[PDB]
Design a protein around this ligand. Sequence first.
Ligand SMILES: [Mg+2]
Ligand SMILES: [Mg+2]
Ligand SMILES: [Mg+2]
Ligand SMILES: [Mg+2]
Ligand SMILES: [Mg+2]
Ligand SMILES: [Mg+2]
Ligand SMILES: [Mg+2]
Ligand SMILES: [Mg+2]
Ligand SMILES: [Mg+2]
Ligand SMILES: [Mg+2]
Ligand SMILES: [Mg+2]
Ligand SMILES: [Mg+2]
Ligand SMILES: [Mg+2]
Ligand SMILES: [Mg+2]
Ligand SMILES: [Mg+2]
Ligand SMILES: [Mg+2]
Ligand SMILES: [Mg+2]
Ligand SMILES: [Mg+2]
Ligand SMILES: [Mg+2]
Ligand SMILES: [Mg+2]
Ligand SMILES: [Mg+2]
Lengths: 67, 156, 70, 117
Amino acid sequence: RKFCRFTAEGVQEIDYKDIATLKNYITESGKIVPSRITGTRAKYQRQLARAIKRARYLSLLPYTDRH
Amino acid sequence: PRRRVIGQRKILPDPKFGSELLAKFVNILMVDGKKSTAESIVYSALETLAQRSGKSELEAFEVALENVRPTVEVKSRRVGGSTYQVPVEVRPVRRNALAMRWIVEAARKRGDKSMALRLANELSDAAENKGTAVKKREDVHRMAEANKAFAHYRWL
Amino acid sequence: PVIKVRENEPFDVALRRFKRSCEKAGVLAEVRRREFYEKPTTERKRAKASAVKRHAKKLARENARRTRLY
Amino acid sequence: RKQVSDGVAHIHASFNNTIVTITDRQGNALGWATAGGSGFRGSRKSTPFAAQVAAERCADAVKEYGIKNLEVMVKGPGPGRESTIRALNAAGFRITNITDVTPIPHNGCRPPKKRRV
RNA sequence: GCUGCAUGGCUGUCGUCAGCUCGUGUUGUGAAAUGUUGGGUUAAGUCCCGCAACGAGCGCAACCCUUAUCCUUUGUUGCCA
RNA sequence: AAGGCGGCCCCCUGGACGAAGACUGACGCUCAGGUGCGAAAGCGUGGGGAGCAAACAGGAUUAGAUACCCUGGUAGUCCACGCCGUAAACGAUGUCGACUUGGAGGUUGUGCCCUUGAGGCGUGGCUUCCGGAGCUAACGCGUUAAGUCGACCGCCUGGGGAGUACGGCCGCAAGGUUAAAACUCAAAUGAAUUGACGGGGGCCCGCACAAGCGGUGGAGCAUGUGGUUUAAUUCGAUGCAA
Ligand SMILES: [Mg+2]
Ligand SMILES: [Mg+2]
Ligand SMILES: [Mg+2]
Ligand SMILES: [Mg+2]
Ligand SMILES: [Mg+2]
Ligand SMILES: [Mg+2]
Ligand SMILES: [Mg+2]
Ligand SMILES: [Mg+2]
Ligand SMILES: [Mg+2]
Ligand SMILES: [Mg+2]
Ligand SMILES: [Mg+2]
Ligand SMILES: [Mg+2]
Ligand SMILES: [Mg+2]
Ligand SMILES: [Mg+2]
Ligand SMILES: [Mg+2]
Ligand SMILES: [Mg+2]
Ligand SMILES: [Mg+2]
Ligand SMILES: [Mg+2]
Ligand SMILES: [Mg+2]
Ligand SMILES: [Mg+2]
Ligand SMILES: [Mg+2]
C-alpha cells in the first residue's frame, strides 16, 4: 500500500536545511515518526533521523511541542 | 439469564378497563399474595379521580404516570476499583415499571385515613405535578445531573 | 498535547481531543515506563518476547487464512 | 481581594494523590486543594472521585478572586487527570486552553529499582 | 466396652457435574497418542461439519411414576342433562 | 574476534562487502606452550558525586523477619592511570574447507530490461522464520546443520568428596589458574508419556453474581450445639458435607 517518498526522486542525502519534508515527518509533539507508519525506506530513515537532529540542534525545528 | 435470553412476561390485562398497566400496577401493589383487596382499592382510587378530574379517568392516570416516569437511571458499577454510578437511558418497559413502584411506597409514607384514600391523593397530586412523586423525580434528576460527571467514566 | 479551543467547540469534544492527543503523544505510556528502572537484560528479553509473539501471530494469520475449517 | 479575571489551573495527579492549584498568569498561587484535604485516607485519595471533590473546593476557594477564564496544565499519570477537568468545567469556568505539561525525560538519570511486592 | 486408621453393608459430598473407557486402524523406538481435539451448537462427550480415524460401551437422553387433553370400557358406596 | 558499541558535530583510525580489471604465484588451514583483548562486581592513587543504591538506621509485616514493602542512606556506579581475568563470558553448538531439495522476509551492494512510471528479470555479502531428505535418546537441528565429509586443536569417562586440599605460577588483596587422593552411595542424570498439583492462564455453565421479592443477624419463645456446672448432666455428628 504505502511507498517511500524519497525513493520517487533521487536523493543523495537528506538535507537538514530543508523544512519541507521535515515538518511532516515530525509529529505535533515534536517527536519523529517511525518508518512503520510513514512507509519510508530504512535507507533514508537513518538520514531523516540525522537530518531532524541537526535541524533541532540549529533551532530550525523543535525538540518538543512546547520548546 | 446467563445462557438463554428470554423476553418479558405477559400479564392478563385489566378486566374493568382493558389496560395492561393497571393490572401490573395492582400486581406490584399486591403484597403477601393478596390481589382480591388490591383490585378493590385500585377501582376505588380511579373512581375518586374520575369524579374529581374529567370523567375519563384513563387520561388522568396517564398524565399522573408520564410526569413521573423516569427516562434516566443510576447504576452502580466498579471497573477499575472505584464506585461508578453510571447513568443510562432505560427502555420503556422498565421506565414505567420503576415509576409506579416508587408511587407505591410514596403513598405508604403519605399516611392518610386509609390506603385507598392515600393512593387517590397521591395519584391526584401527581396530575398537578406537585406530588411527592415529582419531588422524587426532581431528586433523581439532580443526582442524574450530578452523575453526568460519571457519565463518561468507564463502561459509559 | 497543547490544544486551543476553536470556535463552536463544546467541552465534550475539547476533552475528547485532549484524551486522543494523549495517546497519540503516548505520554502516559512513557511515564509508566520510567516509573521503574528496567535492566538492559530486561528490555532485551521483553523486546525479544514481543518480537516472537508479533511474528508468531503474523504467520498464524496466514496459516488460519490458508487452512479450511468445516 | 485583587480581581484579575484570568488565571491558570494546574492538575498534578500522582498515582497516590492529586493536587489542584489555580494560579495567575505569572505563577503566583491563588489557591489549592487536594484529595487528602478533602478528607480521604489511603486508596480513597487515589480514586478519581477524590480528584472530583477537590476541584469544586479549589474553585470555590478562588471564587473570591473573580476568575472565570483559565487554562489547565495537566501533569502526572495518576487517575483523576480527566475528572478534575469536567469538575472545574462544572464549577463554571470557560476553559481557554488544555495543555499536557508532564515531564518526560530524554532518558536522563536513573529510576528507582523495581518493586518486588 | 476400644479401634470406622482393619473391615462388610449403608450413606454424605463435588453433583445430575458431563464425563469414563474399549475394539480395530493409524502414529510414535517406546511409555503411549489419535479417537475424546478443532468451528459451531446443546441441558448434556446433545448434534452437525471438519478432522487418521472407523465404530462400540458405561454415563446424557429414552423406557418407569405423576400432572396437563381426548377416545373407548364398568357404574356403586361416587354423578344428576 | 569476543566482551561489547545509541544525542549531533569535528580530528585520528581498524575491519567488512560489491563492480570491472591488473598483479604475486600455494605465500595456505589449524595450533600445545606464549602473547594480546576480555561485562559487571572488586582493588590502588588522585578527582567527581545529580540520580540510583550494597552496608547501616528507623517504620511496618510476621509466631520470629538479620528479608520481601516504606522513609533515609555510605561505599560503589562517573573520569584519569594501573591491577584483577572472572560470568547462564550462551548459539549452553571450536576454527577452516567442500558437497547436499525448497519458501517467505530484513539489511547492504550491483548488472539489466518500452529504464516510460509510484514496474519486473539477475547477481553477491550479511541476517531472522518455517520446513524436506538426513541425522538425533527425544526435544529438535535442518545450506548460518546437530546432514555428508576431510585438517587440526580443546575436552569427557558414575553421583558426591571437588574444581576442594597440597605444590607451582600470577595478584596489593579478594582471589585466579594447573589440579588429586582417601572416604561414601547404587545410583546421579537427559528427553519425553500418563496422571496429580500450581498462592498459572483462556473459554463455557449453575439463583454464582447482577436485576427483584421476602428474610436472617435486632426482640420474645421453641430447638440443637459449644461452654460451664453437677452425682450424672448417656453416646455419636464438627467448613461448605456437624
Ligand atoms: Mg472411612
Ligand atoms: Mg487402538
Ligand atoms: Mg507401530
Ligand atoms: Mg476426557
Ligand atoms: Mg486422549
Ligand atoms: Mg488429548
Ligand atoms: Mg468442540
Ligand atoms: Mg444433565
Ligand atoms: Mg453419548
Ligand atoms: Mg471428531
Ligand atoms: Mg437418564
Ligand atoms: Mg566497573
Ligand atoms: Mg575505585
Ligand atoms: Mg530501599
Ligand atoms: Mg554476554
Ligand atoms: Mg569458565
Ligand atoms: Mg561453556
Ligand atoms: Mg586461528
Ligand atoms: Mg527448523
Ligand atoms: Mg582454587
Ligand atoms: Mg435473633
